[PDB]
Design an enzyme around this catalytic site. Structure first.
Site, mmCIF file in Angstrom:
data_model
loop_
_atom_site.group_PDB
_atom_site.id
_atom_site.type_symbol
_atom_site.label_atom_id
_atom_site.label_comp_id
_atom_site.label_asym_id
_atom_site.label_seq_id
_atom_site.Cartn_x
_atom_site.Cartn_y
_atom_site.Cartn_z
ATOM 1 N N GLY A 258 1.012 -1.128 -0.060
ATOM 2 C CA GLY A 258 -0.218 0.197 -0.036
ATOM 3 C C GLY A 258 1.104 1.117 0.026
ATOM 4 O O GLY A 258 1.178 1.869 0.936
ATOM 5 N N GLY A 259 1.538 1.125 -1.132
ATOM 6 C CA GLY A 259 2.745 1.823 -1.567
ATOM 7 C C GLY A 259 3.469 2.992 -0.870
ATOM 8 O O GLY A 259 4.558 2.919 -0.740
ATOM 9 N N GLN A 260 2.405 3.825 -0.289
ATOM 10 C CA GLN A 260 2.534 5.132 0.553
ATOM 11 C C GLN A 260 3.998 5.877 0.491
ATOM 12 O O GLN A 260 4.874 5.150 0.593
ATOM 13 N N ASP A 261 4.088 6.919 0.374
ATOM 14 C CA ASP A 261 5.079 7.468 -0.137
ATOM 15 C C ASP A 261 6.489 7.233 0.479
ATOM 16 O O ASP A 261 7.401 7.041 -0.174
#
Lengths: 123, 139, 604, 272, 159
Positions: E52-55
């Protein structure tokens, strides 16, 4: 030119005066002008000179909430004094004396003229 | 209330192989050790009902071959503290069903570590009821 | 904690096993379906029947109002759907959707839909705009479909309960649930949703007497609850308060706090079992079908606790059940009478006790707040507890420096700075106590007047009221007493003499104290002293001030409300809702005064 | 007996495809040993570890879980990252037993950022509410560090305290108060009411009696007025107990040169 | 096989994942505190990393390396926005170079009614034909259908 005279002098470093004299006697009792540990806490001491009376105000702007700024002291009188001025402690941060003053000249030969109650509002 | 300043697990031979310094105030690992030298050594192979060093409480369980220690401040209640001192002491004992030795430690190193964390975690005693515990854990 | 709380036996009917209930919000009408087979719609307010319909005479299981639609939906277990336009009760349409006993309808409100579950082990969706199309059929059953509820929150997604004990939650893209979970160890009678959008709970019902909470987002049974006295016919979410309503197969009410989760109370209208429930979405009034009848109860306060400093901060606490943690508001800006305003943001507080009174110190300052039945007084700026104790009833010594109390007995003790004032110590029959300048003890359907230092029965007047507001300096005082109202003078001197002379009447109080000036026959929504002016609300929603022999409506208000505060300087009134938008209308006090004075002959 | 440098390379071997739960467990023990006697620490070494530890998580094995906690727990004031953990963390949280949960909070608390906090608060609410005290207890301690860090927002929570305030486990009864005190101790006043709060109250996991004593005195001490009605109530009670220590506790303090009430003290004393 | 399923939090990758994996889904936010998951398919033993790739982590998403060999790159098909340009190219190229030792199979998600702008334009833009390169598949999906899923895996379970 009492203990209180020393106070007349202590007061003297300020120069916004509108008369003073030499202190005659001082306060028989300092009054906490704000009751017990208030949002702001005041104890006040009153000083008499042959000419003027200064109320110099001792204190710990209490809450760390606040610093009070633009501070001056109103007094409004019943039994005479000529009211010259109300003093502003430019700034008052928390737990800290600063000084504000209120000044009067004392009429002496009148029937009813130096015992007074003055009404206070902090701004 | 954060009682364990530190906790030490000690030889007969006056050494410490476990200590978790619940809080340090004189630094280093080192500095702890010097202290050992005095203290342990001196005490070594003999315990107290009470012992003190300088307003601090000195606590601990022994074995013939092994030493247990807890430090707190002597400024407070023997009994509880003892109760605790034991609580540990027993728990482990019970747990172990054996007297720890030098042997005990090598015999299983893990258990100590594991043990160490559960009751006290840096300083305060979280965990307890040793039997309970004992049962409580096993995994 | 106490039932010092609103419970009203709002409306009653004794009847049969009223199975179903459905609410008309949009006009608080209620629809009920009976085990008789007759269904009726009532305006409860005056216990009046809006309409009744014999839809079938077989017990009629399901009901809806379709408000948007302006029509009312009905179904009976002739397996047909009969429609009325409720706009008479003129019956629009009929057709056979589900061919078996039709248990429940759930509706999409946003979107034009009627969802139905029926015992045929079928859920059908029908589209009203398509003119009752069976748009889609939802299936994945194992038994009769006992209940459908739409998660209206996500209308769009919904949940289903069956007594084969399982719950399917569905996605449109699942004319089947997304999944089924194995809820009950009994059967899942019912499924219900958690009022807030924020978090998500369902409660489901069983008579097994175990409750499980579930969080959907995680997808857990949050927890499982026990304690119970009898098969819970039903248990429900309080949507107003955090409490749990439990219901039984005998019609037992037990409440557990949905926060304490402690049994707060048991109530018996042993009208037998909880057949239905329906709740006000405004979260305050609810109705349930019982056998012996049904009862509806009214359960609310009308306000938060707040009191306003004339700088301009109405400090309230809470919001509605939110922590008290939120007080403040000195604002910063100005705008038009009609138009609306902005607030500041900086909470203080996070009390525990749940109040229902706020009252300022006489200088705003010290508030004494009561809640849970005890009084915390705060040092406010301080955010300090100024003080605490348990009440029963109260008066501040108006002066701003003493206070009185009515002990949960009923016998007076008063404290000034925690010193009892016994110089004054009647303890006569009361009703309530009133402070102010002049002491009221309201007793024996009378209001009796007392000194401030010793008691004196100054006067007694005819009846009892409800409330007193005193002019400011006390002088002319305003007492609210249902419809009717009076304005008075209190005349001192007489007393001084009389007292000196001593010999008096006090049964009546002494007829030589007060005078009855005039009375307005009045209904008050809220009311005000501007000085001795009575500026008031009426609950007829005109804001009027009785002025000059005149009562004038400055303005009339939506429906009536709460008087924000007129900070005189500004000469304006801040008006207050209860929903935290403030409106202001300026007057100018002087004008009133100007009028006051001149009549008084102070023309100049 | 054994040495660090080699080990430091070797630990990652568990991270190498290697299946043999035991082997790694042991190796972990050693690391901890190095550490236990005393060990340098640092980032690079950590970071590499960060990737290394991380993959290893299809383990079901409960005990396996244990091991992890410990290690992580090791990293706290010198902690590195949290987001990965979130999922992991979540896993303990949803995780069946109770157990998993307590360790995680425990590392977390010296180390973390405001921000996430909000979220994790909810979890806290839950912990706060659970009947098996333990975890709840686990929750509490963390907070303290969080108090280290800060804990003020923790304050906001007072309410929870109340819901909690109902207690029935002795130790537990004890724990709540400790916090509380801290809290109100920034505050005289409430406390005065608190006293009252307990006043209706006796105490479950005693211990509670004792902190309270110090406390109960501590207001009084300065002359929180009346020894007489309040104090005394406490005292008869105090006196009465077989929590001899409690009796003592009172006794020890009252050290009064004239004998405030010299007499009684002597019985207590006799008893001593 | 460490096969990395990539994309953001908020994608609803996760939804897919467990839909496949467990049969059942979970929120349209891909993970915050990761997935490592194991799946046997065709009885072959697989590790799924779901991001939930999130920066911040995204930046660090490289964060690990060893034993890398396969990509599910979840990209949302209908994503009209975050998909191409600098970001897309950068990610792709970087990844490619770094682990030229693993096939890149990109997954295009929630295709529903496709709310892209041309299947053709994009594939090209990604230089899908820059191919002369590692086993590739460009693959369409809307999650709910799972419009291409089993092949991805299947074709994959090719040796």
């Amino acid at each position: 030119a009492t203990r209180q005279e020393i106070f007349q002098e202590q007061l003297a470093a300020v120069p916004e005066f509108q008369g003073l004299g030499p202190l005659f006697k001082s306060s028989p009792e300092p009054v906490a002008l704000t009751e017990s540990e208030t949002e702001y806490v005041i104890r006040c001491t009153k000083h008499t000179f042959s000419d003027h009376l200064v109320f110099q105000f001792d204190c710990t702007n209490t809450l760390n909430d606040q610093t009070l700024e633009n501070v001056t002291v109103q007094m409004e009188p019943t039994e005479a004094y000529e009211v010259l001025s109300y003093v502003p402690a430019r700034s008052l941060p928390y737990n800290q004396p600063g000084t504000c003053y209120t000044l009067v000249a004392l009429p002496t030969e009148d029937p009813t003229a130096v015992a007074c109650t003055f009404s206070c509002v902090m701004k | 209330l954060y009682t364990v300043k530190a906790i030490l697990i000690l030889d007969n031979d006056g050494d410490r192989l476990f200590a978790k310094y619940y809080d340090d105030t004189y630094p280093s690992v080192k500095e702890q050790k010097a202290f050992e030298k005095n203290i342990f050594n001196k005490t070594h192979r003999t315990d107290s009902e009470i012992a003190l060093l300088e307003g601090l409480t000195v606590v601990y369980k022994s074995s013939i071959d092994l030493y247990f220690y807890v430090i707190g401040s002597s400024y407070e209640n023997e009994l509880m503290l003892m109760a605790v001192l034991n609580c540990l002491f027993d728990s482990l004992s019970q747990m172990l069903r054996k007297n720890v030795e030098k042997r005990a430690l090598l015999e299983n190193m893990e258990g100590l570590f594991l043990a160490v964390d559960e009751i006290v975690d840096g300083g305060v005693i979280l965990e307890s009821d040793p039997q309970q515990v004992v049962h409580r854990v096993a995994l | 904690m106490p039932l010092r709380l609103d419970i009203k036996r709002k409306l009653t009917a004794r009847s049969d096993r009223v199975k179903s209930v459905d609410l008309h919000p949009t006009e608080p009408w209620m629809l009920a379906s009976l085990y008789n087979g007759s269904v009726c719609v009532w305006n409860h307010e005056t216990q009046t029947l809006v309409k009744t319909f014999e839809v079938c005479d077989l017990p009629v299981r399901a009901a809806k109002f379709v408000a948007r639609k302006n029509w009312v939906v009905t179904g009976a277990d002739d397996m047909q759907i009969r429609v009325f336009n409720y706009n008479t009760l003129e019956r629009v349409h009929m057709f056979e959707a589900h061919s078996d006993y039709i248990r429940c309808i759930a509706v999409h409100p946003t979107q034009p839909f009627i969802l139905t579950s029926s015992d045929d082990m079928l859920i059908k969706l029908w589209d009203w705009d398509k003119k009752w199309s069976c748009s889609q059929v939802f299936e994945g059953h194992t038994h009769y479909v006992m209940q459908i509820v739409i998660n209206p929150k996500d209308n769009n997604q919904f949940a289903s309960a069956s007594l084969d004990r399982t719950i399917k939650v569905w996605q449109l893209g699942s004319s089947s649930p997304n999944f089924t979970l194995e809820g009950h160890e009994k059967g899942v009678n019912c499924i219900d949703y958690y009022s807030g959008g924020d978090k998500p709970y369902l409660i489901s019902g069983a008579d097994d007497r175990l409750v499980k909470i579930w969080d959907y987002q995680n997808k857990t049974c949050v927890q499982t609850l026990e304690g119970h006295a009898q098969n819970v016919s039903c248990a429900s979410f309080h949507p107003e308060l955090p409490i749990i309503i439990t219901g039984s197969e005998d019609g037992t009410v037990r409440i557990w706090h949905s926060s304490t989760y402690r049994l707060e109370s048991t109530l018996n209208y042993g009208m037998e079992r909880v057949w239905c429930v329906a709740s006000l979405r405004g979260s305050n009034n609810v109705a349930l079908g019982y056998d012996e009848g049904s009862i509806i109860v009214k359960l609310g306060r009308e306000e938060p606790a707040m009191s306003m400093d004339a700088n301009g901060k109405i400090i309230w606490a809470k919001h509605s059940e939110v922590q008290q943690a939120n007080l403040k508001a000195m604002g910063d800006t100005e705008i038009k009478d009609g138009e609306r305003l902005p607030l500041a943001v900086k909470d203080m507080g996070s009390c525990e006790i749940y109040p229902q009174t706020i009252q300022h110190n006489p200088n705003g300052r010290f508030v004494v707040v009561c809640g849970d039945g005890e009084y915390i007084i705060y040092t406010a700026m301080a955010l300090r507890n100024k003080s605490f104790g348990s009440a029963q009833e109260f008066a501040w010594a108006h002066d701003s420096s003493e206070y009185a109390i009515r002990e949960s007995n009923s016998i007076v003790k008063i404290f000034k700075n925690f010193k009892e004032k016994k110089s004054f110590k009647p303890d006569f029959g009361a009703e309530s106590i009133y402070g102010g300048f002049l002491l009221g003890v309201r007793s024996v359907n009378g209001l009796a007047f007392y000194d401030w230092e010793n008691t004196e029965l100054i006067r007694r007047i005819e009846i009892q009221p409800k409330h007193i507001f005193w002019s400011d300096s006390g002088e002319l005082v305003c007492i609210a007493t249902e419809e009717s109202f009076f304005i008075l003078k209190y005349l001192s001197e007489k007393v001084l003499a009389a007292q000196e002379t001593h010999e008096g009447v006090t049964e009546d109080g002494i007829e030589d104290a007060f005078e009855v000036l005039g009375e307005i026959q009045e209904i008050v929504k809220t009311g005000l002293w501007v000085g001795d002016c009575f500026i008031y609300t009426s609950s007829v929603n005109r804001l009027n001030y009785y002025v000059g022999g005149e009562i004038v409506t400055i303005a009339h208000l939506d429906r009536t409300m709460y008087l924000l505060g007129y900070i005189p300087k500004d000469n304006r009134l801040y008006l207050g809702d209860k929903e935290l938008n403030i409106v202001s209308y300026s007057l100018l006090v002087s004008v009133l005064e100007y009028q006051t004075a001149v009549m008084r002959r102070d023309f100049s | 007996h054994l040495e660090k440098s080699a080990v430091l390379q070797e630990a990652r071997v568990f991270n190498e495809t290697p299946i043999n739960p035991r082997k790694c467990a042991h190796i972990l023990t050693k690391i901890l040993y190095l550490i236990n006697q005393g060990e340098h620490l640092g980032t690079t070494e950590a970071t590499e570890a960060f990737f290394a530890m991380t993959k290893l998580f299809q383990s079901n094995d409960p005990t396996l879980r244990r091991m992890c906690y410990l290690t992580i727990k090791e990293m706290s004031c010198i902690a590195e990252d949290v987001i990965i953990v979130t999922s992991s963390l979540t896993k303990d949280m949803t995780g069946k037993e109770d157990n998993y949960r307590g360790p995680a909070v425990r590392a977390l608390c010296q180390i973390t950022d405001s921000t996430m906090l909000q979220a994790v608060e909810r979890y806290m609410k839950q912990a706060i509410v659970d009947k098996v005290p333990s975890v709840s207890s686990s929750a509490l301690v963390s907070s303290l560090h969080l108090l280290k860090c800060s804990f003020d927002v923790v304050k906001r929570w007072v309410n929870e305290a109340q819901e909690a305030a109902s207690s029935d486990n002795i130790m537990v009864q004890y724990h709540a108060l400790g916090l509380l005190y801290h809290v109100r101790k920034n505050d005289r006043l409430a406390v005065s009411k608190m006293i009252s709060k307990f006043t209706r109250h006796g105490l479950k996991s005693p211990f509670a009696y004792c902190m309270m004593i110090r406390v109960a005195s501590k207001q009084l001490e300065e002359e929180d007025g009346s020894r007489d009605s309040p104090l005394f109530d406490f005292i008869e009670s105090c006196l009465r107990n077989k929590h001899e220590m409690v009796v003592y506790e009172a006794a020890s303090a009252i050290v009064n040169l004239p004998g405030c009430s010299a007499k009684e003290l002597a019985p207590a004393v006799s008893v001593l | 096989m460490r096969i990395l399923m990539v994309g953001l939090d908020g994608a609803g990758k996760t939804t897919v994942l467990y839909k496949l994996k467990l049969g059942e889904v979970i929120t349209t936010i891909p993970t915050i505190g990761f997935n490592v998951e194991t799946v046997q398919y065709k009885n072959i033993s697989f590790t799924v990393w779901d991001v939930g790739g999130q920066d911040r982590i995204r930046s660090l998403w490289r964060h690990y390396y060893r034993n890398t060999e396969g990509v599910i790159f979840v990209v949302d098909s209908n994503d009209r926005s975050r998909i191409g340009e600098a970001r897309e190219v950068m990610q792709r190229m970087l990844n490619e170079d770094e682990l030229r030792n693993a096939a890149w199979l990109v997954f295009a998600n929630k295709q529903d009614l496709p709310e892209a702008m041309s299947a053709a334009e994009i594939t090209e833009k990604l230089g899908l034909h820059s191919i002369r390169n590692r086993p590739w598949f460009i693959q369409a999906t809307c999650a709910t259908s799972g419009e291409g899923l089993y092949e991805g895996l299947e074709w994959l379970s090719n040796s």
